[PDB]
Structures are given as structure tokens and as C-alpha cells.
Amino acid sequence: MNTVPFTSAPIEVTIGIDQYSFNVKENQPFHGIKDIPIGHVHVIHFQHADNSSMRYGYWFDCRMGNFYIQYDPKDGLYKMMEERDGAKFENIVHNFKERQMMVSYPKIDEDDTWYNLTEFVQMDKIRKIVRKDENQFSYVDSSMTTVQENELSDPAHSLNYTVINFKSREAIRPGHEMEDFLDKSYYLNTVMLQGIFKNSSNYFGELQFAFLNAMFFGNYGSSLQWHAMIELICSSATVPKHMLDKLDEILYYQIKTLPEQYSDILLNERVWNICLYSSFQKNSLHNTEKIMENKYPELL
Amino acid sequence: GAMNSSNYAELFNNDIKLFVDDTNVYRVTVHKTFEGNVATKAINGCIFTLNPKTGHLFLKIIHTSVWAGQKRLSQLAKWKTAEEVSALVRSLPKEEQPKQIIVTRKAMLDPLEVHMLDFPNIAIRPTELRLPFSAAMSIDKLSDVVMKATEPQMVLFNIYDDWLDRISSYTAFSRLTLLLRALKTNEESAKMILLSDPTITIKSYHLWPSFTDEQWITIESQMRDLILTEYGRKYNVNISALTQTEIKDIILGQ
Ligand SMILES: CCCS(=O)(=O)Nc1cc(N)c(F)cc1F
Ligand SMILES: CCCS(=O)(=O)Nc1cc(N)c(F)cc1F
Ligand SMILES: CCCS(=O)(=O)Nc1cc(N)c(F)cc1F
């Protein structure tokens, strides 16, 4: 079980670790998060108490190195940093644990929520979507734009999601205009799955990563990407049976986890109505349709 | 964006544009079967593609053979329209290609945008104008060429005959829309007004009669009264009580 120590907490902040969060007071003796499950990516995230537009965080995997958080009073944020001296790191963590100044990653033993939300998400794929190759962890925030959003400004600070555009030459074979527009099977299976993602696992990885960035940071372009990747499957007549069964599970846990009070901003009425009620796959997402109908029946 | 009353002069500027009307592409007669069920029988249709500045009409005849063994014909009709418009643009020299295509029905936007992905600089626009282009099949010579077709065919007309020798494209378009509005509201009456006088004929190479400038004023007045008379017959309104501001608005309103 791994540990992300903190140097200090000089400014009052809500700290998120995956789906959990807690309030830390200005100069409270907080020195970090222990008992973080090995085997999954994690996200530590922040919202300053004095400025709620400061909403940002770090994707990391404790198997890849020893990471800590230190507030930078110049740039005015909690920064992730890698400690390359193993023995120093272990000595620092040991002191903070002994003096019990760390919160415990509060995982219920029965609870597979985080696994279910991150099943296909890999740190190496995150680092291709978020380019900063000198760090093993990836910074995201509420305002970062997508490559697609920047086509329709700063290219170094963008989310490099796979561009999906239903009215593009990539999506439509010359001579198959009506066929390819009304049945997106070609675009899903040949262009995206076989061509770009190589397999459904990388496609689901990017879909789950887009959802999590939408939910944890309110990142608008991530929300667009999550819905585009859902609509591309639901609008395809020919999808492998395993992919549909897996999509239903993925979406079920995403809808389960979504805070009720953010449904109005994080869910697109047109996409969900089309996907559950009009699309080729309208009868293929049993679990997702039942939780959507019981939790968000106004949206539909 | 959307072509409306506000941006109406844009039709007669020097940027090449085409209107596309798909109303007459898929046409059926509904009839009873021997078993007392209902069946459709398709008849020949046409795409109405018009340069409102020049009067040039690209009438693509849609032969019933197009529909043989196809399903969802009302949806296919939009995609076949977009395919034929796309083929027409690709057939024109670059300097004759339109800069904009205005579709009379919003359902044509996606089919045409997808067929025109090769032409990113051609704007595909809807209109807020309720244009009476469905009444094209009330023009005897256009009806005649569509119904006689035995195969897919493109036929080229000038829907303004020689009017642009004497009037602007703005006025020519207004005359065309008034004639088509009248034909659409009361075809028999409209035809009676146009063809009553045996002395005024249609040249072999024209669609409409050879009216003098004064005779066109009388005709246009008779067409406006027909539209008013029918709006009176329709809504049970005394058209005597109507003012000139009341009259003007109900014709435009349409
Ligand atoms: C007390 C010394 C360590 S610290 O300055 O509080 N913060 C810190 C510093 C390093 N280098 C680390 F790997 C972990 C840490 F928590
Ligand atoms: C040789 C075209 C004759 S026409 O039908 O009278 N007028 C005309 C019609 C079309 N459609 C055109 F592109 C050019 C034209 F001059
Ligand atoms: C667009 C049809 C033009 S029109 O034949 O001139 N109709 C018309 C006729 C009159 N008298 C008017 F005041 C306004 C109009 F629009």
C-alpha cells in the first residue's frame, strides 16, 4: 500500500483522492494520504477554498515512482513532484505515519467502484493524452482544452484525445455517404478500433479517462469526448458482443458514481435519449438503461 | 447561417449560389390493393436546382427505377438528392461551382453536407423563406419532360425565359415566386389567368407566355388577387374589408 506524503497544507483546500474527498484547513498539520491501493491509476485533485476556479490534479501510479505534493507559493498551487532518493522518501513517510498526520485511503473491502471506473485506464495511455514527458504523473485542470476544441489555443497544455467527427472524411467513405452516416460501423471498427486504438481496451481506456476528467475537474472537452465515444458505439449496427456487454458495465458504474446534483451539466440529453431509445444499441445496454431510468428520469 | 427576409438581396449578388428543392424527388399515388390494403406506386420525380441570379434550372429527372428494391424511400430521397447535387457541382468547371447551396428543407442539410465534404468552401445553408418550388410540377413543360422520362436525365431550362433582358434578377425572382405561389394555391385558376388569352403564346424555347411589360403587370395583379381570393375562401375572411397593408403582408407572410 503506497503513500503520497505532503510537505504541508499552507492554504485551505478540498483534497480529492479518486472518488473520495476531505477538507484541509489553512496550516492544518496534514502530511498526506497513506494505504493507496497498488494496481490502479489514481488521481489526487484540489479545489482551493478561497478560489473554486482553482480545480486541478495529478494522475499517477505509485508503481512508477515515489511522488509527494508540495505547495508552490509562487504558482499558487499544490504540485506533484517525484523523489528519486528511495531511502529519504521512505524515512520521511515513516516519520509522518508514526506521528499519524496522514489520512487513510478509505477503501471498503466489498467496494469495486474504483476498479470499475479505471478498468482499462493505463498511465502510459494517459501520458500520450497529456504530454509532459519529463514527469511520470499527468496534470489536468478544469480549463484545459482538447485538440478538437482548439481546431474549432496553447498546444503544450491540451488534452490530446482521439478526434471523433461524424461529418468528416475520416468518418465517411466516398460512395458510402448515407451508409456510413446512418451506420457508423465502418468508422468504429475499421478507422477507430483496427486503425487508431488497435483494440477495444485502449478505446474503453480513453472513454473512462474522458469521463473521469469531466467528473473530477468539470472539464467540458472531456465531457464532449466521453459522449462522442458512447455515441460512436451506439450509432454502429455492427459491434462485437463483448464490447457491448463491457460498455453496459462501464456506463453503469459511471452513472452510479456521478453526483446527482451535477447530472444537469455532465449528461447530454440528446446523446443519452438517442443511445438508449433510438440507436442500433437501444436494447443492448440493460444495466445502463435501468440505472438511468431510476436515477435521472427527468433527463430522458 | 439561415437565409431570411433580412439577407434577401444576397440572392442577387455576384457569388454563385443554388437553391435545392427536394419536394418532388419522391412522388407516389396511394391506392387500394385487391385485398383492401393500401399500396403506393411511385411516379417520376425531379430535383429542382435553381441559380436565382441567372434563372438557370438544373432539373435532374428521378426515374421510378431509382427506387426499385430500396427501403425507407422518403429517407433515401434526401440522400439521392444530395448525391445528384454533389455530382452536378463536380460536373461544373471550378469558376461555375456555387459558393453556397441553400436547401428549401432542413432535412437536406446533413445529407448534402456529408456528400459535399470534398468541398469545404461551399456553404450549405437552410432558409427561413417558405418558397413555392413544389409547384414546379405545375409548369406544363417541366411536368411533361418528367412524366415522359424512361431513364435518369438532366434537362436544363431558364426559368425566367428572356425576362432578364428587361428586368433585374430581384424582380424576375419575385415574379417567379408569385407565379409559383399562385399555381400552388389554385393551379386551375393560375393556369386560366396565364393561358386565357389565345393571342399571347409561349415560345417553343420558353416556359411562360410572351407577356408585354404592361400585360405582366395585369397578370401579376390577377395572381395577387387569386392568392387573396383563396386565402379568403380558406379562412372564411371577407377580403373586401382588407386594406393594402393587410393584402401586402398575407402574400409575403406566405
Ligand atoms: C520534512 C522533510 C520532508 S518535507 O519537506 O516535509 N516534504 C517531503 C519532501 C520530500 N523530498 C519527499 F520525498 C517527501 C516529502 F513529504
Ligand atoms: C444551354 C443552356 C440553355 S438554358 O436552359 O436556356 N439556360 C441555362 C440553363 C442552365 N441550367 C445553365 F447552367 C445554363 C443555361 F444557359
Ligand atoms: C415577391 C412577390 C412580389 S410582388 O408580386 O410584387 N408582390 C407584392 C405586391 C405588392 N403590391 C406589394 F406592395 C408587395 C408585394 F410583395
Side-chain angles (χ1 to χ4, degrees), chain A residues 1-151 154-300, chain B:
Chain A
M1 308 300 276
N2 284 95
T3 295
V4 168
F6 280 48
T7 296
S8 59
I11 72 164
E12 187 170 318
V13 58
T14 304
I15 307 186
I17 173 73
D18 300 350
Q19 76 267 35
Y20 310 111
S21 71
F22 54 91
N23 291 321
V24 170
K25 298 292 173 291
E26 172 199 334
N27 285 305
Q28 184 186 322
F30 175 78
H31 295 278
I33 307 169
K34 61 180 194 143
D35 303 325
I36 300 168
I38 313 177
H40 307 114
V41 304
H42 296 287
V43 56
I44 286 169
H45 44 110
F46 301 95
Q47 199 156 34
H48 298 183
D50 82 347
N51 186 351
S52 2
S53 75
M54 293 273 77
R55 182 117 98 128
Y56 63 93
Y58 305 91
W59 290 93
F60 69 90
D61 182 333
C62 281
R63 294 178 289 189
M64 296 301 291
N66 295 323
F67 304 114
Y68 65 103
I69 296 287
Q70 179 165 117
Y71 181 71
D72 176 4
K74 181 168 188 137
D75 290 344
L77 78 177
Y78 288 99
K79 291 193 170 164
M80 182 160 283
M81 297 208 278
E82 184 176 351
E83 182 52 77
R84 262 157 156 273
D85 189 344
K88 186 183 178 195
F89 187 80
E90 291 167 16
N91 185 234
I92 279 289
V93 167
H94 182 264
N95 177 92
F96 285 154
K97 277 196 190 178
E98 280 291 67
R99 299 205 303 144
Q100 292 191 44
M101 291 171 172
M102 294 190 161
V103 291
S104 179
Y105 186 100
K107 200 199 156 300
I108 302 331
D109 291 332
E110 171 180 355
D111 182 15
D112 268 349
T113 296
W114 190 244
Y115 175 72
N116 290 325
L117 292 168
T118 63
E119 178 173 1
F120 297 102
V121 181
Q122 326 173 248
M123 262 315 306
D124 63 309
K125 297 308 201 309
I126 290 175
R127 294 184 74 227
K128 294 178 195 303
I129 296 165
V130 189
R131 315 198 148 289
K132 206 170 199 282
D133 298 304
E134 67 266 32
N135 298 327
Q136 298 277 288
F137 52 80
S138 299
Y139 171 87
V140 182
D141 71 27
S142 46
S143 67
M144 278 163 60
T145 55
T146 74
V147 166
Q148 163 167 94
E149 276 182 313
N150 290 332
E151 291 170 356
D154 192 78
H157 203 71
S158 286
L159 293 165
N160 189 30
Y161 291 120
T162 297
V163 181
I164 299 169
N165 180 0
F166 298 144
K167 302 193 288 183
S168 71
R169 174 51 66 221
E170 292 83 0
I172 308 292
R173 287 170 296 176
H176 305 249
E177 286 83 0
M178 185 181 191
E179 165 184 17
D180 283 354
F181 189 67
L182 289 182
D183 176 2
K184 319 227 177 264
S185 293
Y186 158 68
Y187 193 34
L188 174 67
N189 293 307
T190 309
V191 179
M192 289 285 164
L193 282 179
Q194 296 165 221
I196 296 179
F197 285 101
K198 304 316 185 179
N199 56 58
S200 65
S201 294
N202 293 338
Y203 185 101
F204 290 143
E206 185 172 329
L207 184 160
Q208 284 181 317
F209 185 54
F211 173 75
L212 290 170
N213 285 325
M215 181 171 64
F216 287 137
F217 306 114
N219 186 267
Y220 179 74
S222 296
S223 183
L224 292 182
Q225 184 70 8
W226 176 55
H227 288 95
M229 298 189 80
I230 296 170
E231 190 172 5
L232 174 60
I233 294 173
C234 293
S235 296
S236 296
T238 308
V239 188
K241 315 88 166 59
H242 78 271
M243 264 190 79
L244 291 172
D245 290 334
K246 188 53 65 158
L247 179 59
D248 193 30
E249 292 300 316
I250 289 166
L251 295 182
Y252 174 81
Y253 289 108
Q254 292 174 335
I255 297 308
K256 186 171 174 65
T257 306
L258 264 184
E260 292 77 4
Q261 303 290 296
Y262 291 46
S263 54
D264 59 319
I265 60 170
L266 290 174
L267 300 179
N268 186 288
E269 181 171 299
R270 181 197 58 92
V271 171
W272 281 98
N273 273 290
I274 276 49
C275 287
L276 296 182
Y277 300 126
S278 330
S279 75
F280 288 111
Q281 303 310 339
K282 63 198 167 303
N283 287 331
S284 303
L285 310 174
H286 301 112
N287 296 356
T288 293
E289 190 167 298
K290 187 169 299 312
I291 190 173
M292 280 293 300
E293 288 188 349
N294 282 279
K295 186 168 186 208
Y296 297 118
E298 339 78 37
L299 195 89
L300 310 170
Chain B
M3 202 270 288
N4 57 37
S5 266
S6 293
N7 54 29
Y8 182 73
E10 190 179 4
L11 293 182
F12 317 115
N13 82 1
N14 289 97
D15 286 357
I16 299 168
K17 44 186 66 67
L18 298 171
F19 279 114
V20 170
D21 183 76
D22 69 317
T23 302
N24 289 306
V25 168
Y26 176 50
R27 300 207 286 159
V28 298
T29 60
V30 175
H31 65 88
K32 279 292 189 61
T33 66
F34 184 79
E35 296 79 27
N37 302 130
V38 172
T40 58
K41 179 189 163 308
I43 62 168
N44 292 343
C46 60
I47 308 165
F48 179 101
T49 301
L50 172 66
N51 185 332
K53 177 92 166 144
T54 59
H56 287 196
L57 177 60
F58 300 91
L59 196 73
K60 176 66 186 226
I61 303 174
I62 307 298
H63 185 260
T64 58
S65 62
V66 168
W67 313 131
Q70 305 295 317
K71 275 109 170 70
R72 297 187 51 74
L73 298 183
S74 60
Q75 176 186 76
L76 179 64
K78 295 170 210 316
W79 292 88
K80 173 58 172 198
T81 299
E83 188 174 62
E84 287 297 349
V85 167
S86 177
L88 167 65
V89 173
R90 292 167 215 267
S91 77
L92 291 165
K94 198 192 203 190
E95 63 271 13
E96 292 176 38
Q97 292 177 340
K99 294 312 176 73
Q100 297 175 24
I101 302 165
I102 307 166
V103 298
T104 64
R105 305 201 301 174
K106 286 167 231 156
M108 279 299 308
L109 290 163
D110 279 347
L112 192 53
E113 295 183 20
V114 168
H115 272 280
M116 300 290 287
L117 289 171
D118 287 338
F119 295 98
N121 300 330
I122 304 178
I124 303 301
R125 296 181 51 208
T127 183
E128 290 177 39
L129 300 183
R130 187 165 50 251
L131 296 162
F133 295 151
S134 68
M137 283 303 92
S138 298
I139 301 169
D140 291 319
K141 284 190 196 187
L142 304 189
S143 192
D144 284 359
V145 71
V146 167
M147 285 323 276
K148 298 185 225 292
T150 58
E151 53 188 319
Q153 200 183 336
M154 168 79 92
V155 189
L156 308 187
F157 298 88
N158 186 341
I159 204 162
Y160 297 158
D161 294 340
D162 64 346
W163 304 342
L164 294 184
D165 297 342
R166 296 193 64 77
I167 66 182
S168 72
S169 64
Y170 181 106
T171 304
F173 192 76
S174 283
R175 179 177 294 162
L176 176 68
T177 63
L178 173 62
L179 288 172
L180 288 178
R181 179 57 66 200
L183 285 160
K184 188 168 180 175
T185 316
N186 197 320
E187 181 181 26
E188 181 209 310
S189 286
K191 287 197 201 213
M192 278 177 62
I193 292 171
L194 286 168
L195 312 181
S196 48
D197 187 342
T199 63
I200 315 163
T201 63
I202 306 172
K203 291 307 145 291
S204 59
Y205 51 90
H206 282 170
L207 292 180
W208 312 102
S210 295
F211 292 123
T212 63
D213 290 10
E214 290 316 302
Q215 283 171 346
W216 267 128
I217 295 298
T218 299
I219 292 295
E220 288 168 4
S221 190
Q222 288 181 319
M223 293 298 191
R224 292 193 189 94
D225 181 28
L226 169 159
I227 294 166
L228 225 227
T229 286
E230 284 307 327
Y231 164 106
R233 275 135 99 147
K234 170 153 175 191
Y235 295 101
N236 288 319
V237 162
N238 194 354
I239 61 145
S240 307
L242 294 190
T243 68
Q244 285 299 309
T245 331
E246 274 174 330
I247 293 164
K248 152 117 213 190
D249 300 357
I250 301 165
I251 296 157
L252 248 79
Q254 295 191 52

